[PDB]
Design a protein around this ligand. Structure first.
Ligand SMILES: *[C@@H]1O[C@H](CO)[C@@H](O[C@@H]2O[C@H](CO)[C@@H](O[C@@H]3O[C@H](CO[C@H]4O[C@H](CO)[C@@H](O)[C@H](O)[C@@H]4O)[C@@H](O)[C@H](O[C@H]4O[C@H](CO)[C@@H](O)[C@H](O)[C@@H]4O)[C@@H]3O)[C@H](O)[C@H]2NC(C)=O)[C@H](O)[C@H]1NC(C)=O
Ligand code: HXM
Ligand code: NAG
Ligand code: NAG
Ligand code: NAG
Ligand code: NAG
Ligand code: CL
Ligand code: CL
Ligand code: CL
Ligand code: CL
Ligand code: CL
Ligand code: CL
Ligand code: NA
Lengths: 358, 358
């Protein structure tokens, strides 16, 4: 009889619950499991936040889970109640598909890693493109919300590390008449424009930019994934370059890698001395899990090179490093892949890029 | 006049009779029910408030506890925002300053803002010409608002402030690498402002002592929530610790439960006597995904502008009391918290002109 250590998961469907079970069973097969052996405990998202928080207590923490994998559901329901409730006890949470930058804020999310990068990390790819295509002067338009400013912060860090940002412009999320803002951009000499915005906000930008004839030849538009999704795509100027996170939405893939990482980390934890159990249930328990913060360190330092979504490491915020992106280019109104960022290197493929105009 | 239901929730031994006996000409009258509660984990607090809200019609909650648990405040904000129900944290963990409440919380706390305590702490230092200091915080929410307030104050001052060092301590990870010790070693200043939780402070002081920063020549100043319950004094707290404090000398629990009920009742009367309706108490927590568009934080305008019985019980939009009388306290040679100043009408009235020792 070994010791049974539960991993927890909050996942979108019961197909994914079953994938998580099979992942944990594989880890037990793969590892030496005489001393410790993992057990999968899981659940699908509840219809609202308060119910979800309760479920984490009743269904997961009641089984003394050492960690909790969480996906982004199909339908306003975030990982946030799971992060809070698990965080109360310093039980680590692994985000599988959540990409909002807010989850990188340690104050709000103590014990939160994720196997996909935040949107703001798309700046890494922008920067490498700017070196590659020698865009040494860029304008940067961003939404004045957390996410928009996160992208600005991140790009500026890379520039104040050479290419430069000639100006940075921010607009109120929800604005449609962005002619005022874009005229300000039109008047600068730089004709490379980088955009961080939500779907609907990018649409507003794209329209206004078209009226002002800033989508034609001369101009380069360089955006991320949100800004060429759904309704943004539907008005985006031809020639635009944007990004898609490869496997960014494969819950199954990230369950596979998350479990591998967590399994590794568990076995690495139990090499060390004086490991305590997490609290059994929520009721009556108000102290942190003494070992939580150690386990968080172990996870953070976890390297898993041979992963399905590539090379798994985490940065100082617990965000995924070495993520891989499709570099997409709108050509005759079709999104066409012109290369990939492979984790560190831009690899152009044989499909020629077509810029706005050309 | 019609009745609104107000739940008063008391965690920990309480003179329920002193409270009832201690407590309305308006357009609406309170029907107050005392619930008692023994536990302050998330599940216990959530289910208890949800059960109340479904086994009765609750216009608002008044919450008091006897713990040092700042998490209770977090939990209450979440609950308040999800159910759009007014919750007043009037004592204990419930009252320990939560920074960055939800956009749509109706959660208000008895006690001083982070910014107000920062300015009180600089006033203390000015009185004794303590112009040279460092700051130490953890990542506990508010820590930026704290540091910014200081920085903002002293960069706008004709006074010769010298902020030598600001340390940010990561206690979401374990301290096996003696990292936090190495950060603390870097402190030279004779005054040290510490922003963190009580439980965090406990550990920081232990380390600080080990590297000789608790003795004579070093003075630490901490905010209310570190001192917390002053009848409970961790052994690692250094004698000569100074704290700001709103823990219930001159403003006793009975008088607060009184005002809590007054604030909620008045607020509702004011809204009814202008709009001819008040928000219908939520049938449950478990149908809040449905009743979204039917609910509002409308009642907030009124909650934050109640004058009752000659006192301005206004809140800030940030959700804290506007004009609290604060006591400055000192941890003395008998390990007892002692009153050494008042802060009243933006004037600081200290006891000593020169600080005694031993
Ligand atoms: C994303 O794409 C990048 C770039 O392609 C990959 O990084 C490269 O990985 C390859 C391995 O596939 C590395 O190739 C090795 O290079 C060694 C020398 O590297 C030096 O010189 C290069 C070129 O000037 C520099 O870029 C580098 O910084 C070093 O200064 C060779 O010695 C290796 O040869 C070995 O293997 C061969 C078999 O092919 C044997 O015959 C040899 O005996 C020897 O053992 C090898 O060729 C390359 O160095 C990496 N480049 C960089 C920049 O790091 C990433 O792997 C890829 N990422 C993902 C996730 O796919
Ligand atoms: C800020 C959010 C809103 N808050 C939500 C918490 C919450 C909410 C609802 C429920 Cl239901 C529950 Cl259960 C919990 C997170 C939590 O307050 C993180 O607090 C910390 C952060 C840092 C520190 N210092 S550090 C990083 O050095 O260790 C300490 C404590
Ligand atoms: C998702 O990843 C799994 C591997 O874990 C793979 O079998 C499947 O084909 C992937 N789906 C897509 C759409 O790539
Ligand atoms: C944990 O450390 C304590 C203190 O020495 C000791 O009593 C106990 O046996 C240890 N447990 C393990 C599992 O090492
Ligand atoms: C709390 O404990 C008291 C006894 O100290 C008991 O009478 C009461 O029923 C308990 N309340 C709850 C909610 O369990
Ligand atoms: C509301 O605030 C106003 C300040 O604009 C002030 O008249 C008073 O404090 C409040 N009015 C009331 C309580 O009727
Ligand atoms: Cl439970
Ligand atoms: Cl190409
Ligand atoms: Cl209880
Ligand atoms: Cl919330
Ligand atoms: Cl406080
Ligand atoms: Cl505490
Ligand atoms: Na994180």
């Amino acid at each position: 009889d070994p010791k049974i250590v539960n991993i927890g998961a909050v996942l979108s469907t019961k197909k994914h619950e079953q994938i998580f079970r099979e992942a944990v069973n594989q880890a037990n097969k793969r590892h030496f499991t005489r001393k410790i052996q993992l057990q999968a405990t899981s659940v699908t998202h509840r219809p609202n936040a308060i119910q979800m928080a309760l479920s984490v207590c009743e269904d997961l923490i009641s089984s003394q889970v050492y960690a909790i994998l969480v996906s982004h559901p199909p339908a306003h329901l975030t990982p946030t109640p799971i992060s809070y409730t698990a965080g109360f006890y310093r039980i680590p949470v692994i985000g599988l598909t959540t990409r909002m930058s807010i989850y990188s804020d340690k104050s709000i999310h103590l014990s939160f890693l994720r196997t996909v990068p935040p949107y703001s990390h798309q700046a890494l790819v922008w920067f490498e493109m700017m070196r590659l295509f020698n865009w040494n002067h860029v304008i940067l338009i961003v939404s004045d919300d957390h996410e928009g400013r996160a992208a600005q912060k991140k790009l500026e860090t890379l520039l104040e590390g050479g290419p430069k940002a000639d100006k940075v412009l921010q607009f109120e999320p929800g604005t449609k008449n962005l002619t005022a803002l874009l005229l300000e951009a039109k008047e600068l000499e730089a004709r490379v424009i980088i955009l961080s915005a939500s779907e609907d906000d990018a649409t507003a930008v794209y329209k206004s930019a078209a009226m002002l004839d800033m989508t034609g030849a001369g101009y380069v538009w360089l955006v991320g994934e949100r800004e060429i999704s759904g309704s943004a795509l539907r008005y985006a100027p031809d020639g635009i370059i944007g990004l898609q996170l490869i496997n960014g939405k494969n819950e199954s893939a990230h369950i596979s890698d998350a479990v591998a990482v967590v399994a590794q980390a568990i076995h690495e934890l139990f090499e060390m001395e004086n490991i305590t159990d997490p609290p059994r249930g929520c009721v009556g328990n108000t102290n942190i899990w003494k070992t939580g913060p150690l386990f968080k360190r172990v996870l953070m330092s976890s390297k898993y090179p041979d992963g399905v979504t590539g090379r798994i490491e985490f940065n100082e915020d617990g965000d995924r490093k070495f993520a891989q992106y499709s570099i997409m280019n709108l050509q005759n109104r079709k999104l066409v892949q012109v290369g990939i960022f492979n984790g560190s290197y831009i690899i152009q493929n044989d499909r020629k890029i077509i810029w706005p105009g050309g | 006049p019609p009745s609104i239901g107000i739940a008063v929730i008391l965690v920990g031994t309480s003179d329920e009779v002193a409270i009832k006996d201690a407590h309305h000409h308006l357009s609406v009258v309170p029907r107050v029910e005392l619930v008692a509660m023994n536990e302050t984990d998330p599940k216990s607090i959530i289910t208890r408030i949800c059960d109340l809200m479904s086994d009765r019609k609750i216009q608002g909650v008044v919450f008091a506890d006897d713990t040092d648990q700042e998490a209770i405040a977090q939990i209450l904000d979440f609950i308040s925002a999800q159910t759009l129900t007014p919750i007043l944290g009037i004592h204990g963990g419930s009252s320990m300053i939560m920074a960055d409440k939800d956009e749509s919380s109706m959660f208000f706390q008895f006690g001083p803002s982070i910014e107000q305590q920062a300015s009180v702490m600089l006033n203390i230092m000015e009185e004794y010409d303590w112009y040279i200091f460092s700051i130490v915080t953890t990542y506990f929410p508010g820590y930026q608002d704290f540091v910014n307030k200081i920085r903002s104050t002293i960069e706008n001052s004709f006074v010769g402030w010298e902020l030598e060092e600001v340390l940010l301590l990561d206690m979401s990870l374990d301290d096996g690498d003696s990292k936090i010790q190495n950060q603390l070693k870097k402190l030279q200043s004779p005054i040290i402002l510490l922003y963190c939780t009580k439980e965090e402070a406990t550990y920081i002081f232990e380390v600080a002592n080990s590297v000789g920063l608790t003795g004579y020549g070093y003075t630490w100043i901490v905010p209310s929530l570190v001192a917390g319950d002053t009848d409970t004094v961790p052994s690692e707290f250094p004698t000569g610790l100074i704290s700001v404090s709103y823990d219930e000398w001159d403003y006793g629990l009975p008088a607060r439960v009184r005002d809590g009920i007054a604030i909620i009742t008045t607020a509702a009367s004011d809204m009814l006597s202008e709009h001819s309706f008040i928000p219908e108490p939520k049938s449950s927590c478990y149908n809040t995904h449905e009743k979204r568009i039917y609910q509002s934080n409308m009642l907030n305008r009124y909650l934050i502008n109640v004058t009752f019985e000659g006192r301005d019980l206004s809140f800030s939009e940030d959700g804290y009391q506007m004009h609290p009388k604060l006591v400055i306290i000192l941890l003395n040679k008998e390990r007892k918290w002692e009153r050494v100043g008042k802060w009243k009408d933006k004037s600081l009235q200290m006891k000593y002109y020169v600080w005694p020792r031993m």
